[PDB]
UniProtKB/TrEMBL annotation:
Residues 159-550 form the Glycosyl hydrolase family 13 catalytic domain. Belongs to the glycosyl hydrolase 13 family. Ca(2+) 2 binds at E471. This is Pulullanase. Keywords: Calcium, Glycosidase, Hydrolase, Metal-binding. PANTHER family: GLYCOGEN DEBRANCHING ENZYME. GO terms for molecular function: metal ion binding; pullulanase activity.
Amino acid sequence: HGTIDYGDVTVTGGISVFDAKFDELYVYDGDDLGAVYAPEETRFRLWAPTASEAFVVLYETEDGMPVKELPMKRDVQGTWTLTVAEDCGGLFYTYRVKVGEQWNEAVDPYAKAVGVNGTKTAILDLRSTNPEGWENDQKPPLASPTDAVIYELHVRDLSIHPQSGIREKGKFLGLTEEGTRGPNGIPTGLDHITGLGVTHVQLLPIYDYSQESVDESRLDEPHYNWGYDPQNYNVPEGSYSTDPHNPAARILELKRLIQKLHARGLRVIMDVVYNHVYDGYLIHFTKLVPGYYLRYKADRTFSDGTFCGNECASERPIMRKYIIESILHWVREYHIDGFRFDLMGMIDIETMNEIRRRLDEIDPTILTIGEGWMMETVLPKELRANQDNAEKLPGIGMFNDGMRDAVKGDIFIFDRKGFISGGDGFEDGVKRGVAGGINYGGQLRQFAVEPVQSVNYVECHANHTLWDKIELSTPGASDEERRAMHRLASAIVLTSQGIPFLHAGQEFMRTKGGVENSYKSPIEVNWLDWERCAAHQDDVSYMRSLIALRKAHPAFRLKTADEIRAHLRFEAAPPHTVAFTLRDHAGGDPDRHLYVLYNANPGALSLELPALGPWEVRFGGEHVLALEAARLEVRGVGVVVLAVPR
Ligand SMILES: OC[C@H]1O[C@H](O[C@H]2[C@H](O)[C@@H](O)[C@@H](O)O[C@@H]2CO)[C@H](O)[C@@H](O)[C@@H]1O
Ligand SMILES: OC[C@H]1O[C@H](O[C@H]2[C@H](O)[C@@H](O)[C@@H](O)O[C@@H]2CO)[C@H](O)[C@@H](O)[C@@H]1O
Ligand SMILES: OC[C@H]1O[C@H](O[C@H]2[C@H](O)[C@@H](O)[C@@H](O)O[C@@H]2CO)[C@H](O)[C@@H](O)[C@@H]1O
Ligand SMILES: [Ca+2]
Ligand SMILES: [Ca+2]
Ligand SMILES: [Cl-]
Ligand SMILES: [Cl-]
């Protein structure tokens, strides 16, 4: 890149953008940043306190020359304003500012529609993008975060396989198509997903990500990217629409997607990346108010805790404002039902709690989960929204990595075994996740105050898939033996307290051919392979059965830590097993008691059962040789569930 000029210090009373004092000036509190369109007129408002001049630049085409360049009026609390008294429909615009001696041109940070590749703001009456009946759109019910079953999905993965039977492959609208068939007539797409019994689809980045990741003008050529490279936070990604050149198309089709998912009983969680931008020098934030929206060390270099080049300065009030209004826009405009915060440890506690509060005033059933890893940054340690500070983040879920590693083995040392694959000493790790990560007792405690704070998982888009990790850590084993370990791991997720999270394709043992980090690998690596799905319908049914077992038993879904400490009991069990009971109608369970065995021992075992009444088999009967008087005779790797009826 070229030159960054942080401003003529006399424009802001001698106070530099880097000064702590700066945060108390220009604290704009209005609701109208960006552009408000109507046929009569359009009103623009930009926050640019360090600029000495500011212009609205109008274009007639997404690539044309400027047709108009209009000065803005210096307004209150650091903002500039303009009213254009023409019908601006179908126009495009940018802002041009002078900061120091530099002139910079930039998309509106509050852009709601953009041209192709997102380099100009597009002026649009967004009510014209609503699908028919949008006002009647109703959410499926959701009584507790522990009642969710999350399915993590990438819009391109879903349909791009050539046998997916979906017409609009790789597009938002691909996930609206019903009755789509794959190899040998199996259901694919939305019908496959609703068939599973999952409750929430969690979509990898659907905000507009950088042209460097996917070029929206060359979709006739191979392309793929997860999209963790944010460019326009409040507009949908162009490559997922049928026409990235038509500003309304991506907006209307995302809404048609969310509407259809809601009609079929599914809620939508948005993966959201407010911790960094695609390029800190070129982003509109830096062109318009250089030095303010991103984090700097003391020597004026970017803080780089993300390893992505930059960090967003969430703790500065105007950025905090920006992030909250961004969240609220996706709620209000697109009816989103949840957010998954990438590297949430980079966001400050105040911001996250304020997000939780604002969403609670709208609808407390909107989910908030995140990656609360402990990671270094210029943000002081006591302000980071991570696992160490979970007790200051009521209501916010975090991925439980201790559970993940204990179950399937270490994700960074590929060959190391975990509980499912016969490693030694992982039983307590598994037990801590069964209890929902809470301070259960003794050495059985993790970071969670309440079970709604723990997301259990054994696979996601990142790192090896569960099947690929098992293969790298079980060199002796057969494919039969590996499938049993895979199934055991899914069963542990779906019978642990907290919030179960599944990766799309885990139900048919999704593989990436051993690729560990597939963020820009081709579609051949990354697609949902509906051929493999057709060959694994038994495994798919097993997963659907696990999901229905969790839905049938509120004891697996307790809401509070007090309930878990009162109803969950760990039983004596030999090495390479975990056994526990959920006693006395836990959480309203129909049965009097439940007994769960996680058995990673391949041979025959004779187990003592607690004397709680006449046990009977409810799941895993294929592993049970007998159920006597009181003892259980078992062979095989897998989960067994017993119950004492009412
Ligand atoms: O932006 C490119 C970037 O994408 C991925 O990094 C993600 C990762 O998937 C997230 O779960 C989390 O760890 O943060 C990153 C986004 O902030 C790739 O892993 C990475 O190689 C790549 O550079
Ligand atoms: O984006 C950085 C990093 O994020 C995750 O790594 C976590 C890991 O999962 C945790 O168990 C713990 O060790 O903290 C790490 C972050 O410092 C991703 O799993 C990893 O791929 C990625 O590079
Ligand atoms: O809940 C019914 C049943 O679920 C599982 O049985 C699966 C089986 O494992 C699959 O291979 C396939 O045959 O479909 C079955 C029904 O979904 C459990 O294994 C079993 O214990 C349980 O009763
Ligand atoms: Ca894009
Ligand atoms: Ca809540
Ligand atoms: Cl495409
Ligand atoms: Cl930390």
